[PDB]
Scaffold this active site. Sequence first.
Site, PDB file in Angstrom:
ATOM      1  N   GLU A 155     -23.482 -70.844 -14.969  1.00  0.00           N
ATOM      2  CA  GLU A 155     -23.994 -70.054 -16.125  1.00  0.00           C
ATOM      3  C   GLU A 155     -22.788 -68.886 -16.587  1.00  0.00           C
ATOM      4  O   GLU A 155     -22.884 -69.379 -18.000  1.00  0.00           O
ATOM      5  CB  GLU A 155     -24.552 -69.248 -15.139  1.00  0.00           C
ATOM      6  CG  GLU A 155     -25.658 -68.064 -15.986  1.00  0.00           C
ATOM      7  CD  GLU A 155     -26.189 -67.229 -15.348  1.00  0.00           C
ATOM      8  OE1 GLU A 155     -25.683 -66.627 -14.599  1.00  0.00           O
ATOM      9  OE2 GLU A 155     -27.439 -66.541 -15.517  1.00  0.00           O
ATOM     10  N   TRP A 205     -32.445 -70.899 -15.061  1.00  0.00           N
ATOM     11  CA  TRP A 205     -33.213 -70.495 -16.276  1.00  0.00           C
ATOM     12  C   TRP A 205     -33.890 -72.011 -16.368  1.00  0.00           C
ATOM     13  O   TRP A 205     -34.128 -72.061 -17.040  1.00  0.00           O
ATOM     14  CB  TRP A 205     -31.657 -70.744 -17.373  1.00  0.00           C
ATOM     15  CG  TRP A 205     -30.709 -69.706 -17.369  1.00  0.00           C
ATOM     16  CD1 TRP A 205     -29.784 -69.174 -17.405  1.00  0.00           C
ATOM     17  CD2 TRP A 205     -31.593 -68.184 -18.617  1.00  0.00           C
ATOM     18  NE1 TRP A 205     -29.463 -68.260 -17.499  1.00  0.00           N
ATOM     19  CE2 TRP A 205     -30.045 -67.535 -18.227  1.00  0.00           C
ATOM     20  CE3 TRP A 205     -32.141 -68.380 -19.327  1.00  0.00           C
ATOM     21  CZ2 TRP A 205     -30.185 -66.358 -18.861  1.00  0.00           C
ATOM     22  CZ3 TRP A 205     -31.988 -66.816 -19.809  1.00  0.00           C
ATOM     23  CH2 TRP A 205     -30.796 -66.091 -19.374  1.00  0.00           C
ATOM     24  N   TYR A 244     -27.648 -64.221 -24.310  1.00  0.00           N
ATOM     25  CA  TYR A 244     -26.085 -64.555 -23.794  1.00  0.00           C
ATOM     26  C   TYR A 244     -25.210 -64.619 -24.090  1.00  0.00           C
ATOM     27  O   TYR A 244     -24.438 -63.946 -25.266  1.00  0.00           O
ATOM     28  CB  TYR A 244     -26.197 -63.946 -22.316  1.00  0.00           C
ATOM     29  CG  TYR A 244     -26.973 -63.062 -21.633  1.00  0.00           C
ATOM     30  CD1 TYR A 244     -26.664 -62.063 -20.896  1.00  0.00           C
ATOM     31  CD2 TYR A 244     -28.122 -63.538 -20.534  1.00  0.00           C
ATOM     32  CE1 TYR A 244     -27.269 -61.198 -20.635  1.00  0.00           C
ATOM     33  CE2 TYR A 244     -28.353 -62.815 -19.852  1.00  0.00           C
ATOM     34  CZ  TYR A 244     -28.500 -61.634 -19.933  1.00  0.00           C
ATOM     35  OH  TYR A 244     -28.836 -60.799 -19.154  1.00  0.00           O
ATOM     36  N   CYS A 261     -31.263 -58.764 -19.058  1.00  0.00           N
ATOM     37  CA  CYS A 261     -30.470 -57.842 -17.832  1.00  0.00           C
ATOM     38  C   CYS A 261     -28.964 -57.055 -18.145  1.00  0.00           C
ATOM     39  O   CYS A 261     -29.177 -55.895 -17.628  1.00  0.00           O
ATOM     40  CB  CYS A 261     -31.115 -58.323 -16.786  1.00  0.00           C
ATOM     41  SG  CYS A 261     -32.906 -58.711 -16.326  1.00  0.00           S
ATOM     42  N   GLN A 270     -26.458 -51.752 -16.043  1.00  0.00           N
ATOM     43  CA  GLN A 270     -27.943 -53.324 -15.756  1.00  0.00           C
ATOM     44  C   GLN A 270     -29.481 -52.674 -15.806  1.00  0.00           C
ATOM     45  O   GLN A 270     -29.568 -51.297 -15.329  1.00  0.00           O
ATOM     46  CB  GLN A 270     -27.923 -54.339 -14.776  1.00  0.00           C
ATOM     47  CG  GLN A 270     -28.690 -55.238 -14.436  1.00  0.00           C
ATOM     48  CD  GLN A 270     -29.024 -55.923 -13.204  1.00  0.00           C
ATOM     49  OE1 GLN A 270     -27.325 -55.748 -12.293  1.00  0.00           O
ATOM     50  NE2 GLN A 270     -29.478 -56.671 -12.780  1.00  0.00           N
ATOM     51  N   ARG A 271     -30.003 -52.906 -17.060  1.00  0.00           N
ATOM     52  CA  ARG A 271     -31.529 -52.050 -17.248  1.00  0.00           C
ATOM     53  C   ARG A 271     -32.585 -52.605 -15.980  1.00  0.00           C
ATOM     54  O   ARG A 271     -33.408 -52.252 -16.189  1.00  0.00           O
ATOM     55  CB  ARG A 271     -31.641 -52.409 -18.849  1.00  0.00           C
ATOM     56  CG  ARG A 271     -32.612 -53.847 -18.899  1.00  0.00           C
ATOM     57  CD  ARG A 271     -33.492 -53.948 -20.279  1.00  0.00           C
ATOM     58  NE  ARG A 271     -34.168 -55.609 -20.459  1.00  0.00           N
ATOM     59  CZ  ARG A 271     -34.618 -55.862 -19.766  1.00  0.00           C
ATOM     60  NH1 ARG A 271     -35.550 -55.172 -18.853  1.00  0.00           N
ATOM     61  NH2 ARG A 271     -34.965 -56.992 -19.375  1.00  0.00           N
ATOM     62  N   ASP A 317     -33.331 -56.096 -10.111  1.00  0.00           N
ATOM     63  CA  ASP A 317     -34.177 -56.997  -9.180  1.00  0.00           C
ATOM     64  C   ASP A 317     -32.787 -57.237  -7.557  1.00  0.00           C
ATOM     65  O   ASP A 317     -32.266 -57.715  -7.695  1.00  0.00           O
ATOM     66  CB  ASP A 317     -34.599 -58.245  -9.379  1.00  0.00           C
ATOM     67  CG  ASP A 317     -35.052 -59.230  -8.277  1.00  0.00           C
ATOM     68  OD1 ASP A 317     -34.787 -59.459  -6.600  1.00  0.00           O
ATOM     69  OD2 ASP A 317     -35.207 -60.583  -8.397  1.00  0.00           O
ATOM     70  N   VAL A 321     -37.268 -52.635  -5.598  1.00  0.00           N
ATOM     71  CA  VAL A 321     -36.966 -53.773  -4.707  1.00  0.00           C
ATOM     72  C   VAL A 321     -38.892 -54.190  -5.079  1.00  0.00           C
ATOM     73  O   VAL A 321     -39.912 -53.439  -4.786  1.00  0.00           O
ATOM     74  CB  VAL A 321     -37.191 -52.528  -3.348  1.00  0.00           C
ATOM     75  CG1 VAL A 321     -37.497 -53.776  -2.355  1.00  0.00           C
ATOM     76  CG2 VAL A 321     -35.822 -52.199  -3.452  1.00  0.00           C
TER      77      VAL A 321
HETATM   78  O1  UMP Z   1     -29.617 -61.289 -14.248  1.00  0.00           O
HETATM   79  C1  UMP Z   1     -30.673 -60.441 -13.489  1.00  0.00           C
HETATM   80  C2  UMP Z   1     -31.561 -61.526 -14.330  1.00  0.00           C
HETATM   81  C3  UMP Z   1     -33.046 -60.412 -14.042  1.00  0.00           C
HETATM   82  N1  UMP Z   1     -33.416 -59.872 -12.833  1.00  0.00           N
HETATM   83  C4  UMP Z   1     -34.182 -59.259 -12.880  1.00  0.00           C
HETATM   84  C5  UMP Z   1     -34.500 -57.948 -13.040  1.00  0.00           C
HETATM   85  C6  UMP Z   1     -36.482 -58.045 -12.989  1.00  0.00           C
HETATM   86  O2  UMP Z   1     -36.997 -58.218 -12.035  1.00  0.00           O
HETATM   87  C7  UMP Z   1     -36.748 -59.192 -13.843  1.00  0.00           C
HETATM   88  C8  UMP Z   1     -36.416 -59.109 -15.346  1.00  0.00           C
HETATM   89  O3  UMP Z   1     -37.865 -58.822 -16.218  1.00  0.00           O
HETATM   90  P1  UMP Z   1     -38.030 -57.585 -17.189  1.00  0.00           P
HETATM   91  O4  UMP Z   1     -37.334 -56.199 -16.650  1.00  0.00           O
HETATM   92  O5  UMP Z   1     -37.721 -57.922 -18.454  1.00  0.00           O
HETATM   93  O6  UMP Z   1     -39.303 -56.936 -16.834  1.00  0.00           O
HETATM   94  O7  UMP Z   1     -35.578 -60.221 -13.203  1.00  0.00           O
HETATM   95  C9  UMP Z   1     -31.789 -59.273 -12.194  1.00  0.00           C
HETATM   96  O8  UMP Z   1     -32.092 -58.203 -11.937  1.00  0.00           O
HETATM   97  N2  UMP Z   1     -30.924 -60.150 -13.037  1.00  0.00           N
END
Ligand code: UMP
Lengths: 547, 547
Positions: free
Chosen positions: B321, B343, B369, B429, B448-449, B452, B491
Amino acid sequence: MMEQVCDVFDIYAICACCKVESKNEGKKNEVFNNYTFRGLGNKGVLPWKCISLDMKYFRAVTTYVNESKYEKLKYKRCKYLNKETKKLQNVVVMGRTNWESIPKKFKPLSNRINVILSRTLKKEDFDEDVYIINKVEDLIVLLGKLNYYKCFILGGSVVYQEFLEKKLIKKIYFTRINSTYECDVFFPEINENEYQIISVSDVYTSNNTTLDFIIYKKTNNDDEEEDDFVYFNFNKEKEEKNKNSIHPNDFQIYNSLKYKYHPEYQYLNIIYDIMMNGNKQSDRTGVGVLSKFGYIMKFDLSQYFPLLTTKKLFLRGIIEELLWFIRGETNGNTLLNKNVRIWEANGTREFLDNRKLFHREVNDLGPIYGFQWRHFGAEYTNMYDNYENKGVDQLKNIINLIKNDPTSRRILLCAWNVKDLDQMALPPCHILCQFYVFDGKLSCIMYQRSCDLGLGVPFNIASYSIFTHMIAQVCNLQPAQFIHVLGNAHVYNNHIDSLKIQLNRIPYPFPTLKLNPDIKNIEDFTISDFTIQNYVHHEKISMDMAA
Amino acid sequence: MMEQVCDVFDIYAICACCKVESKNEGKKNEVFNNYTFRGLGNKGVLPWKCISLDMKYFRAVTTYVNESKYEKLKYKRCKYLNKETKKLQNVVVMGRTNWESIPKKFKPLSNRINVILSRTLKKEDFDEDVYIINKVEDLIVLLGKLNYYKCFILGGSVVYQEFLEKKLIKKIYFTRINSTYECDVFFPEINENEYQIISVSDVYTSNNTTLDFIIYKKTNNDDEEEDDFVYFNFNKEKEEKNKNSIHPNDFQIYNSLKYKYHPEYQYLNIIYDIMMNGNKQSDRTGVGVLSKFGYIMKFDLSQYFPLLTTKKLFLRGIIEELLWFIRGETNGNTLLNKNVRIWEANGTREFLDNRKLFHREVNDLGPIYGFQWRHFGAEYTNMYDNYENKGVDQLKNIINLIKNDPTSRRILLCAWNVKDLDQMALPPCHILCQFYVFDGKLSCIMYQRSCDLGLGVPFNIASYSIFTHMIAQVCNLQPAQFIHVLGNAHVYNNHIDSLKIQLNRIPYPFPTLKLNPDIKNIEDFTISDFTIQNYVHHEKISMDMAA
Ligand SMILES: O=c1ccn([C@H]2C[C@H](O)[C@@H](COP(=O)(O)O)O2)c(=O)[nH]1
Ligand SMILES: NC(=O)c1ccc[n+]([C@@H]2O[C@H](COP(=O)([O-])OP(=O)(O)OC[C@H]3O[C@@H](n4cnc5c(N)ncnc54)[C@H](OP(=O)(O)O)[C@@H]3O)[C@@H](O)[C@H]2O)c1
Ligand SMILES: NC(=O)c1ccc[n+]([C@@H]2O[C@H](COP(=O)([O-])OP(=O)(O)OC[C@H]3O[C@@H](n4cnc5c(N)ncnc54)[C@H](OP(=O)(O)O)[C@@H]3O)[C@@H](O)[C@H]2O)c1
Ligand SMILES: CCc1nc(N)nc(N)c1OCCCOc1ccc(-c2c(N)nc(N)nc2CC)cc1
Ligand SMILES: CCc1nc(N)nc(N)c1OCCCOc1ccc(-c2c(N)nc(N)nc2CC)cc1
Ligand SMILES: O=c1ccn([C@H]2C[C@H](O)[C@@H](COP(=O)(O)O)O2)c(=O)[nH]1
């Protein structure tokens, strides 16, 4: 030195003081100090309608006992006087006026021993298990015969006055109520040489006032896991790198504090950290810095407005700037004609030329924050062009999100437009903010790439705090946290002495911010829709001390 | 009951254990447990060359005394024995073989009373100030005679084994050396019923190996300021957000630990904070989340590679990646031809149509990206187009600024192109990453916005740690910190069972990342330039149990 009277008998003063109305000799010309918080009472009652959190504090301080530590104190007490005398209680001392103002449903105070100072009353009137004294020494005696935990002097003024005159208080538990009321009785001037502050709590809102809890102290003229802690610290440093920078005593007052819970310390502790642990570096300006990388600060906007109190700060300029951003403007002159000179240096002929913006009009700052918030991606021409409908209107976009899709993780306002960076008078410091909504409440994170801790960060905290309020209101939400993330965090070399002075000052409880509730859209705010109430602060600091 | 001997006399074991060569099998599927670290010695000497950090630890623990604590220790020992009541020292006990393995200039161990178990040698055979004992009982007798702080059993395996077999060890101070060696002697199998881990230290690097320090405990079959602490704590609620769907024993192992300094707890403490205090919310999918807003984690890349050990992770996918990003590719087919499916969901016809990208070919992910790293501002056409010298090559720019302007506060790589969001298969993200250079070291902040925690964050920490190494190597710097800022930290509801499980696992020492040193340009890395060494981990978990 006879082992002290109030140290043996644990005699403390607990009080609550507001600000006093001495109207109308100015408002902007005020020199604040500890003596500012002073007002005890007015015409037979407290100066305020209620104040529940200070009531709940009083209750817990005056009704808390620790059974274990008592034996250590009972052994200490009997040894001094040569004497011998279900659950354990504290001794609260008050005056007569004080005692007869409290309702009979709430007399006497639950789980305490209720001594009273009065040269009048005798025991017959109170059939209860409550005591009476009549002199300064009669208490000392009455404590000797009784089994208690600690002694709390509840006032009012005369009671307080003479317990400090004869030096019979070791610690002062002092609520600062950050508002003004009419008062006729005042807590006495607390002498500097006698008492010093040792702890300051968090800041709170109870019943339309901010307030803080400070503590003054009197001054002079199983065990295997405690070893396990020393083991885990085997590799820790014996001295830090910035010891060609700092003397032991530069931070005497900052270090003299035991608990520093005031949220301002989140800002002061970062500055301490940099001065102690930071890295000697050059920078673009040439002045040189001490720098560190990566901090987070959080401010609870529901409890206070985070305007720094250890120095004087003004808000008109930064509010004008905020409203200018919201308009989508890039015209430096609009600001200059309001006497806001924030962007002045950044728009000069010399400055624009150093950026190689040879063809840019003076004070045409190019596609900066305002332009990116309202027209991201549009071609920039000049400051006077019509941009209506051109590019991505992020601001409108985040507002629609916050209203219609609050659980979205995409609510972001970004000013760092890579395409446009070189056309900006300078690239943005406040990269972005992200919003978050839960249970009718808005929080905001702002990432800041570069942070002048001495000069910029104080304004930056205030500005995005204000902005968070503005967003919340026009979305029908309550402001929660402003979260400030710091990238390159630096103290400029020419700010050192000024920060040595600032860091040794003790924060005041914070002001609040009031917004005109009628304003329902982000576009509609005007300078007079903003009010800073109860701003109590130390004297100004010129951040380089000669110009 | 008459108390335990080890408790009266404070008998502890201290050892250092490496992993052992069990070759001629193929380490593609390895089971790891506590017994992974068991190697004590080889051919009468230590299996490794030095490991000076362990030696510094060993010395610090075995020579550390607390004078103030002795007066109590003395009382207790003399109580147990019916008795009355230079500098204080610890006692150290070793076997004969162990004593003979020690170099002369170090014998007897300095600042410690030395004791040897031996049948073949007697007192007359030793020049040195040491005690000879021929039976374990005789140490107990000797300990009753001596003035001492604590007693440490130092090995070898025979001494260790019988002390554990005769149950005389109350804590085991255990160093886990995270590398493999030839061994002929082994520390005994510790039984989970008799001893459990109660503390776990930071991870460190010494002499080309990672290591940490854990503590096993024996299981069975002015004090004034502390009131001020309780007073400031008056306004602390009774309960937590969800305190019945979170059982007491959901986290019993997690909560059983006194010291959790292992840097993997920066991640597990976040999950924990969200599980206990998080907010119940919906999200863009129907699954739902517990969420909080704003955290920071700091990982010292100079000491370890922060690859989560509490479950199994593989890096081949995320390295591809990363290599794919660096090449500026937006073609999903490239990663599928290497059997990487990160992806795949986002590149499908159904997925693309649901994003309103009807004119987009399957697996054409749009201006994501890669595109933004090498061509910010360019017009995206299709994944096959030639984009050379179109847009801003952010990646070359930051590499250039790191090399020639390291004190720059503008070293930032941004993926959040507001103009392009809608054309991307999905918004990014990893919003940004900012770099920092000091004293030949590179640090990196990633913002990181959307995080997960169950599934995304573990890989993300890895990606950006790897990325920091690559950037540092091509810039002739050494990696320092990876700093990870979390915005919306969530979570997912379907990850809760498996995270309750993961959080009761105890971390192992981290592995190390090896990059081929010959790679000098960021574009020259290939899959085989990356090696993860000494990855020790708990079993693979499936985060949701519906697939
Ligand atoms: O590298 C990554 C890519 C995606 N996400 C997660 C966060 C979210 O649960 C989801 C993307 O959803 P939105 O925030 O775009 O709704 O994927 C990550 O944690 N890391
Ligand atoms: N935050 C606070 O501290 C607080 C709390 C409650 C109320 N208040 C306000 O403040 C006022 C109370 O303060 P205050 O000082 O004016 O009154 P006070 O301290 O409650 O009582 C003063 C009275 O007690 C008696 N007294 C004082 N010192 C004495 C001593 N050493 N020995 C024996 N008797 C003594 C005097 O005469 P007598 O013997 O005739 O009584 C005096 O009139 C109230 O009116 C109320 O409005 C403040
Ligand atoms: N990595 C680590 O943390 C660590 C720690 C310790 C040791 N080591 C290594 O392991 C090696 C030694 O281990 P080892 O098990 O072979 O030998 P050992 O345990 O050091 O010593 C065993 C010897 O001590 C004597 N002994 C032991 N228990 C006794 C008892 N109850 N009563 C009387 N005598 C007793 C016997 O000596 P006699 O033969 O004289 O009767 C026996 O041969 C060392 O060389 C060292 O390098 C490593
Ligand atoms: C509580 C404010 C207070 N706060 C601090 N930090 N220190 C003090 N000494 C203090 O108190 C002044 C001395 C005590 O004065 C009073 C009179 C009346 C009452 C009352 C009241 N006004 N109303 C009700 N219902 N109950 C009560 C008794 C619960 C409380 C405290
Ligand atoms: C240090 C490893 C070690 N680490 C831990 N956590 N526990 C132990 N029991 C342990 O073992 C010490 C007892 C093992 O016996 C020896 C032989 C040799 C040495 C030696 C050595 N080989 N070289 C030097 N320079 N100094 C020393 C003594 C300072 C030290 C201890
Ligand atoms: O809102 C602002 C604007 C600027 N700065 C400071 C940070 C830097 O010291 C300087 C800008 O310089 P660079 O980071 O762009 O080099 O101004 C702030 O702290 N806050």
